[PDB]
Design a protein around this ligand. Sequence first.
Ligand SMILES: CC(=O)CSCCNC(=O)CCNC(=O)[C@H](O)C(C)(C)COP(=O)(O)OP(=O)(O)OC[C@H]1O[C@@H](n2cnc3c(N)ncnc32)[C@H](O)[C@@H]1OP(=O)(O)O
Length: 334
Amino acid sequence: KFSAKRLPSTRLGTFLENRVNDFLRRQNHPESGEVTVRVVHASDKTVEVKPGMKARFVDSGEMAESFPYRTKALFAFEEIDGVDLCFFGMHVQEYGSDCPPPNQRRVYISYLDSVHFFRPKCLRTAVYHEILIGYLEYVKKLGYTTGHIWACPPSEGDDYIFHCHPPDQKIPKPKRLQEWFKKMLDKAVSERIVHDYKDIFKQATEDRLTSAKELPYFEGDFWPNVLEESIKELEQEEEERKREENTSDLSQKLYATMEKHKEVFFVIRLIAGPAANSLPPIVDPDPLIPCDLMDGRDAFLTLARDKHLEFSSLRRAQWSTMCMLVELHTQSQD
Ligand SMILES: CC(=O)CSCCNC(=O)CCNC(=O)[C@H](O)C(C)(C)COP(=O)(O)OP(=O)(O)OC[C@H]1O[C@@H](n2cnc3c(N)ncnc32)[C@H](O)[C@@H]1OP(=O)(O)O
Protein backbone atom coordinates (compact mmCIF):
# COMPACT_ATOMS: atom_id res chain seq x y z
CA LYS A 1 0.00 0.00 0.00
CA PHE A 2 1.06 3.49 -1.05
CA SER A 3 -1.22 5.16 1.56
CA ALA A 4 -0.10 8.24 3.52
CA LYS A 5 -0.29 6.38 6.82
CA ARG A 6 2.32 3.89 5.60
CA LEU A 7 4.92 6.59 4.84
CA PRO A 8 7.99 6.21 7.09
CA SER A 9 7.27 8.11 10.31
CA THR A 10 9.29 10.53 12.44
CA ARG A 11 9.28 11.73 16.04
CA LEU A 12 8.26 15.13 14.70
CA GLY A 13 5.57 14.06 12.23
CA THR A 14 4.22 11.70 14.89
CA PHE A 15 4.14 14.43 17.58
CA LEU A 16 2.12 16.62 15.26
CA GLU A 17 -0.43 14.02 14.19
CA ASN A 18 -0.84 12.86 17.79
CA ARG A 19 -1.60 16.40 18.92
CA VAL A 20 -4.13 16.99 16.16
CA ASN A 21 -5.98 13.68 16.61
CA ASP A 22 -6.24 14.29 20.34
CA PHE A 23 -7.76 17.65 19.63
CA LEU A 24 -10.06 16.06 17.06
CA ARG A 25 -11.18 13.36 19.57
CA ARG A 26 -12.00 16.02 22.17
CA GLN A 27 -14.12 17.84 19.59
CA ASN A 28 -15.99 14.58 19.06
CA HIS A 29 -17.37 15.57 15.64
CA PRO A 30 -18.87 12.77 13.48
CA GLU A 31 -17.51 14.09 10.13
CA SER A 32 -13.81 14.37 11.04
CA GLY A 33 -11.45 11.64 9.85
CA GLU A 34 -7.98 10.56 11.02
CA VAL A 35 -5.09 12.96 10.36
CA THR A 36 -1.61 11.92 9.30
CA VAL A 37 1.53 14.01 9.46
CA ARG A 38 4.70 12.95 7.68
CA VAL A 39 8.10 14.61 7.28
CA VAL A 40 8.86 13.70 3.67
CA HIS A 41 12.13 15.59 3.35
CA ALA A 42 14.96 16.38 5.79
CA SER A 43 18.41 17.57 4.67
CA ASP A 44 21.35 19.81 5.74
CA LYS A 45 22.03 23.08 3.83
CA THR A 46 23.69 26.49 4.03
CA VAL A 47 22.47 30.02 3.47
CA GLU A 48 25.15 32.25 1.92
CA VAL A 49 25.41 35.93 2.80
CA LYS A 50 24.90 37.75 -0.48
CA PRO A 51 27.54 40.05 -1.92
CA GLY A 52 27.73 43.31 -0.05
CA MET A 53 26.70 41.93 3.27
CA LYS A 54 29.60 39.76 2.19
CA ALA A 55 31.78 42.74 1.47
CA ARG A 56 30.81 44.76 4.56
CA PHE A 57 30.81 42.09 7.29
CA VAL A 58 31.99 38.67 6.12
CA ASP A 59 35.27 39.91 4.60
CA SER A 60 35.85 42.10 7.62
CA GLY A 61 35.63 38.89 9.71
CA GLU A 62 32.72 40.31 11.77
CA MET A 63 30.13 37.80 10.50
CA ALA A 64 30.16 34.21 9.17
CA GLU A 65 29.96 33.71 5.42
CA SER A 66 27.14 31.17 5.61
CA PHE A 67 24.87 29.48 8.16
CA PRO A 68 24.04 25.77 8.29
CA TYR A 69 20.46 24.66 8.67
CA ARG A 70 18.41 21.56 8.42
CA THR A 71 15.43 21.90 6.12
CA LYS A 72 12.25 19.83 6.46
CA ALA A 73 9.01 19.35 4.54
CA LEU A 74 5.96 17.95 6.29
CA PHE A 75 2.47 17.33 4.99
CA ALA A 76 -0.78 16.71 6.82
CA PHE A 77 -3.34 14.30 5.43
CA GLU A 78 -6.91 13.70 6.43
CA GLU A 79 -8.78 10.48 5.63
CA ILE A 80 -12.11 11.40 4.01
CA ASP A 81 -14.54 8.52 3.50
CA GLY A 82 -11.53 6.17 3.50
CA VAL A 83 -9.41 8.13 1.04
CA ASP A 84 -6.26 10.15 1.71
CA LEU A 85 -6.42 13.91 1.25
CA CYS A 86 -3.39 16.16 1.61
CA PHE A 87 -4.71 19.50 2.84
CA PHE A 88 -1.60 21.12 4.30
CA GLY A 89 2.14 21.31 3.81
CA MET A 90 4.98 23.33 5.32
CA HIS A 91 8.73 23.93 4.81
CA VAL A 92 10.85 24.92 7.80
CA GLN A 93 14.47 26.02 8.27
CA GLU A 94 16.09 24.95 11.53
CA TYR A 95 19.40 26.35 12.76
CA GLY A 96 20.97 24.24 15.48
CA SER A 97 23.10 25.06 18.54
CA ASP A 98 26.10 24.40 16.27
CA CYS A 99 25.35 27.46 14.16
CA PRO A 100 26.97 30.91 14.27
CA PRO A 101 25.09 33.97 15.53
CA PRO A 102 22.89 35.76 14.69
CA ASN A 103 21.11 32.54 13.58
CA GLN A 104 21.60 30.01 16.35
CA ARG A 105 18.63 28.15 17.86
CA ARG A 106 16.14 29.74 15.49
CA VAL A 107 13.44 28.18 13.37
CA TYR A 108 11.92 29.87 10.33
CA ILE A 109 8.82 28.98 8.30
CA SER A 110 9.93 29.16 4.66
CA TYR A 111 6.42 28.76 3.29
CA LEU A 112 3.16 27.03 4.15
CA ASP A 113 0.19 26.19 1.99
CA SER A 114 -3.21 24.51 2.22
CA VAL A 115 -6.23 23.48 0.22
CA HIS A 116 -9.52 24.12 1.95
CA PHE A 117 -11.10 20.64 1.71
CA PHE A 118 -10.49 19.49 5.33
CA ARG A 119 -13.69 18.15 6.90
CA PRO A 120 -15.63 19.36 8.74
CA LYS A 121 -15.25 23.00 7.64
CA CYS A 122 -15.75 24.32 11.17
CA LEU A 123 -12.52 22.66 12.35
CA ARG A 124 -10.21 23.56 9.44
CA THR A 125 -8.53 26.68 10.96
CA ALA A 126 -8.37 25.01 14.39
CA VAL A 127 -6.44 22.08 12.91
CA TYR A 128 -3.89 24.32 11.11
CA HIS A 129 -3.36 26.22 14.37
CA GLU A 130 -2.86 22.92 16.20
CA ILE A 131 -0.24 21.80 13.68
CA LEU A 132 1.55 25.07 14.21
CA ILE A 133 1.25 25.14 18.00
CA GLY A 134 2.65 21.58 18.04
CA TYR A 135 5.60 22.44 15.79
CA LEU A 136 6.52 25.39 18.01
CA GLU A 137 6.09 23.05 20.93
CA TYR A 138 8.34 20.36 19.46
CA VAL A 139 11.32 22.59 18.52
CA LYS A 140 11.07 24.35 21.88
CA LYS A 141 11.68 20.98 23.53
CA LEU A 142 14.69 20.35 21.27
CA GLY A 143 16.04 23.64 22.58
CA TYR A 144 15.34 26.07 19.72
CA THR A 145 14.66 29.41 21.43
CA THR A 146 12.97 31.45 18.74
CA GLY A 147 10.50 30.98 15.88
CA HIS A 148 10.23 33.37 12.93
CA ILE A 149 7.31 33.95 10.58
CA TRP A 150 6.94 36.36 7.67
CA ALA A 151 3.24 36.79 6.99
CA CYS A 152 3.23 36.99 3.23
CA PRO A 153 0.30 35.81 1.12
CA PRO A 154 1.20 34.52 -2.36
CA SER A 155 0.96 36.86 -5.36
CA GLU A 156 -2.15 36.26 -7.47
CA GLY A 157 -2.09 33.03 -9.49
CA ASP A 158 0.99 31.94 -7.59
CA ASP A 159 1.16 28.62 -5.67
CA TYR A 160 3.30 28.16 -2.57
CA ILE A 161 3.21 24.37 -2.35
CA PHE A 162 0.10 22.93 -3.98
CA HIS A 163 -0.44 23.42 -7.73
CA CYS A 164 -3.79 25.00 -8.74
CA HIS A 165 -5.75 25.97 -5.63
CA PRO A 166 -9.52 25.79 -6.11
CA PRO A 167 -10.86 28.86 -7.95
CA ASP A 168 -13.08 29.73 -4.95
CA GLN A 169 -10.59 29.35 -2.07
CA LYS A 170 -9.90 32.95 -1.10
CA ILE A 171 -6.36 34.12 -0.45
CA PRO A 172 -6.03 36.23 2.69
CA LYS A 173 -4.71 39.78 2.62
CA PRO A 174 -1.87 40.68 5.00
CA LYS A 175 -3.98 42.09 7.87
CA ARG A 176 -6.10 38.91 7.97
CA LEU A 177 -3.07 36.64 7.74
CA GLN A 178 -1.55 38.67 10.63
CA GLU A 179 -4.66 38.19 12.73
CA TRP A 180 -4.62 34.49 11.89
CA PHE A 181 -1.05 34.09 13.18
CA LYS A 182 -1.97 36.13 16.24
CA LYS A 183 -4.88 33.87 17.10
CA MET A 184 -2.58 30.86 16.77
CA LEU A 185 0.18 32.42 18.88
CA ASP A 186 -2.23 33.48 21.68
CA LYS A 187 -3.38 29.90 22.01
CA ALA A 188 0.28 28.83 22.30
CA VAL A 189 0.86 31.59 24.84
CA SER A 190 -2.08 30.51 26.99
CA GLU A 191 -0.71 26.94 26.86
CA ARG A 192 2.65 28.30 28.01
CA ILE A 193 4.33 27.04 24.89
CA VAL A 194 5.20 30.54 23.73
CA HIS A 195 6.66 33.05 26.19
CA ASP A 196 5.63 36.08 24.14
CA TYR A 197 5.85 37.45 20.62
CA LYS A 198 6.48 40.83 18.95
CA ASP A 199 6.88 42.50 15.59
CA ILE A 200 10.44 42.65 14.28
CA PHE A 201 10.70 46.35 15.08
CA LYS A 202 9.79 46.23 18.77
CA GLN A 203 11.86 43.11 19.16
CA ALA A 204 14.96 44.62 17.56
CA THR A 205 14.74 47.75 19.73
CA GLU A 206 14.35 45.66 22.90
CA ASP A 207 17.27 43.38 21.96
CA ARG A 208 18.93 46.74 21.37
CA LEU A 209 20.51 45.71 18.09
CA THR A 210 22.85 48.28 16.55
CA SER A 211 23.95 46.57 13.31
CA ALA A 212 22.62 44.58 10.36
CA LYS A 213 25.11 41.78 11.15
CA GLU A 214 22.94 41.08 14.21
CA LEU A 215 19.77 40.42 12.24
CA PRO A 216 19.00 36.71 11.75
CA TYR A 217 19.87 35.81 8.16
CA PHE A 218 17.53 33.27 6.54
CA GLU A 219 17.14 31.63 3.13
CA GLY A 220 14.56 33.14 0.76
CA ASP A 221 13.56 35.65 3.41
CA PHE A 222 12.88 39.38 3.06
CA TRP A 223 15.71 40.89 5.07
CA PRO A 224 18.74 39.51 3.25
CA ASN A 225 17.29 41.09 0.05
CA VAL A 226 16.37 44.33 1.85
CA LEU A 227 19.93 44.68 3.17
CA GLU A 228 21.28 44.06 -0.32
CA GLU A 229 18.96 46.68 -1.86
CA SER A 230 20.00 48.90 1.09
CA ILE A 231 23.72 48.63 0.52
CA LYS A 232 22.95 49.08 -3.18
CA GLU A 233 21.31 52.44 -2.40
CA LEU A 234 23.87 53.15 0.30
CA GLU A 235 26.40 52.84 -2.55
CA GLN A 236 24.50 55.03 -5.00
CA GLU A 237 24.44 57.74 -2.31
CA GLU A 238 28.23 57.54 -1.96
CA GLU A 239 28.51 57.80 -5.75
CA GLU A 240 26.30 60.92 -5.53
CA ARG A 241 28.70 62.38 -2.94
CA LYS A 242 31.63 61.26 -5.12
CA ARG A 243 30.36 63.52 -7.95
CA GLU A 244 30.12 66.60 -5.70
CA GLU A 245 33.78 66.10 -4.80
CA ASN A 246 34.50 65.65 -8.50
CA THR A 247 34.98 61.86 -8.74
CA SER A 248 33.43 60.17 -11.84
CA ASP A 249 23.99 54.36 8.02
CA LEU A 250 23.09 50.78 7.09
CA SER A 251 21.30 50.19 10.39
CA GLN A 252 19.43 53.48 9.87
CA LYS A 253 17.36 52.40 6.89
CA LEU A 254 17.16 48.86 8.35
CA TYR A 255 15.26 50.27 11.33
CA ALA A 256 13.18 52.50 9.03
CA THR A 257 12.24 49.61 6.80
CA MET A 258 11.62 47.32 9.79
CA GLU A 259 9.20 49.89 11.23
CA LYS A 260 7.39 50.44 7.93
CA HIS A 261 6.68 46.73 7.41
CA LYS A 262 6.86 45.61 11.06
CA GLU A 263 3.32 44.21 11.40
CA VAL A 264 3.97 41.47 8.91
CA PHE A 265 7.09 40.02 10.64
CA PHE A 266 6.74 37.89 13.77
CA VAL A 267 9.49 37.11 16.25
CA ILE A 268 8.33 34.27 18.50
CA ARG A 269 10.16 33.66 21.78
CA LEU A 270 9.96 30.01 22.87
CA ILE A 271 12.60 30.40 25.58
CA ALA A 272 13.49 33.80 27.00
CA GLY A 273 15.56 35.13 29.85
CA PRO A 274 17.42 32.64 32.03
CA ALA A 275 17.05 29.40 30.14
CA ALA A 276 18.56 30.48 26.80
CA ASN A 277 21.90 31.35 28.43
CA SER A 278 23.08 27.81 29.05
CA LEU A 279 21.43 24.97 27.16
CA PRO A 280 22.51 21.45 26.28
CA PRO A 281 23.28 21.17 22.59
CA ILE A 282 20.40 20.64 20.14
CA VAL A 283 20.02 16.94 19.33
CA ASP A 284 17.68 15.90 16.53
CA PRO A 285 16.63 12.28 17.15
CA ASP A 286 15.14 12.04 13.63
CA PRO A 287 17.19 10.86 10.62
CA LEU A 288 17.92 12.74 7.43
CA ILE A 289 15.30 12.04 4.79
CA PRO A 290 16.81 12.65 1.38
CA CYS A 291 13.98 13.34 -1.01
CA ASP A 292 14.60 15.10 -4.32
CA LEU A 293 10.97 16.01 -4.84
CA MET A 294 10.55 17.71 -1.46
CA ASP A 295 13.77 19.81 -1.31
CA GLY A 296 12.39 23.30 -1.68
CA ARG A 297 8.92 23.86 -3.12
CA ASP A 298 9.69 23.90 -6.88
CA ALA A 299 10.25 20.22 -7.57
CA PHE A 300 6.73 19.18 -6.51
CA LEU A 301 5.18 22.12 -8.33
CA THR A 302 7.07 21.07 -11.45
CA LEU A 303 5.92 17.52 -11.06
CA ALA A 304 2.38 18.80 -10.47
CA ARG A 305 2.54 20.90 -13.63
CA ASP A 306 4.22 18.16 -15.68
CA LYS A 307 1.79 15.42 -14.59
CA HIS A 308 -1.20 17.80 -14.47
CA LEU A 309 -1.89 17.24 -10.76
CA GLU A 310 -4.33 19.87 -9.60
CA PHE A 311 -5.67 20.50 -6.11
CA SER A 312 -8.58 22.45 -7.64
CA SER A 313 -11.37 20.32 -6.11
CA LEU A 314 -11.78 17.64 -3.45
CA ARG A 315 -11.85 14.98 -6.16
CA ARG A 316 -8.79 16.18 -8.04
CA ALA A 317 -6.85 16.93 -4.88
CA GLN A 318 -7.49 13.32 -3.77
CA TRP A 319 -6.24 11.95 -7.09
CA SER A 320 -3.24 14.29 -6.80
CA THR A 321 -2.78 13.13 -3.19
CA MET A 322 -2.62 9.61 -4.67
CA CYS A 323 0.11 10.35 -7.20
CA MET A 324 2.02 12.47 -4.74
CA LEU A 325 2.01 9.49 -2.39
CA VAL A 326 2.92 6.83 -4.95
CA GLU A 327 5.82 9.00 -6.08
CA LEU A 328 7.00 9.55 -2.50
CA HIS A 329 6.97 5.79 -2.07
CA THR A 330 8.70 4.70 -5.30
CA GLN A 331 11.24 7.49 -4.98
CA SER A 332 12.01 6.05 -1.54
CA GLN A 333 13.16 2.71 -3.01
CA ASP A 334 16.23 0.94 -4.44
C1 LIG B 1 5.29 32.91 3.60
C2 LIG B 1 4.55 31.72 4.24
O1 LIG B 1 4.31 30.75 3.62
C3 LIG B 1 4.09 31.85 5.71
S1 LIG B 1 2.78 33.00 5.64
C4 LIG B 1 1.32 32.09 5.31
C5 LIG B 1 0.85 32.49 3.91
N1 LIG B 1 0.46 31.29 3.23
C6 LIG B 1 -0.56 31.37 2.23
O2 LIG B 1 -1.09 32.41 1.97
C7 LIG B 1 -0.97 30.07 1.46
C8 LIG B 1 -2.34 30.24 0.93
N2 LIG B 1 -3.28 30.42 2.04
C9 LIG B 1 -3.73 29.31 2.84
O3 LIG B 1 -3.37 28.18 2.64
C10 LIG B 1 -4.73 29.63 3.93
O4 LIG B 1 -5.19 30.97 3.79
C11 LIG B 1 -4.19 29.49 5.32
C12 LIG B 1 -3.04 30.47 5.60
C13 LIG B 1 -3.72 28.03 5.59
C14 LIG B 1 -5.36 29.90 6.22
O5 LIG B 1 -6.41 28.94 6.12
P1 LIG B 1 -7.68 29.25 6.98
O6 LIG B 1 -7.51 28.66 8.34
O7 LIG B 1 -8.94 28.75 6.28
O8 LIG B 1 -7.70 30.84 7.10
P2 LIG B 1 -8.31 31.83 5.97
O9 LIG B 1 -7.55 31.66 4.69
O10 LIG B 1 -8.17 33.21 6.55
O11 LIG B 1 -9.82 31.55 5.68
C15 LIG B 1 -10.78 31.65 6.74
C16 LIG B 1 -11.84 32.58 6.24
O12 LIG B 1 -11.31 33.68 5.85
C17 LIG B 1 -11.98 34.02 4.55
N3 LIG B 1 -11.15 34.61 3.75
C18 LIG B 1 -9.91 34.17 3.47
N4 LIG B 1 -9.32 35.00 2.59
C19 LIG B 1 -10.22 36.00 2.28
C20 LIG B 1 -10.21 37.17 1.43
N5 LIG B 1 -9.03 37.50 0.63
N6 LIG B 1 -11.30 37.93 1.40
C21 LIG B 1 -12.39 37.65 2.13
N7 LIG B 1 -12.46 36.59 2.93
C22 LIG B 1 -11.40 35.76 3.02
C23 LIG B 1 -12.35 32.62 3.96
O13 LIG B 1 -13.47 32.75 2.99
C24 LIG B 1 -12.65 31.94 4.96
O14 LIG B 1 -14.12 32.06 5.28
P3 LIG B 1 -14.93 30.84 5.86
O15 LIG B 1 -14.71 29.55 5.02
O16 LIG B 1 -14.55 30.62 7.30
O17 LIG B 1 -16.42 31.23 5.69
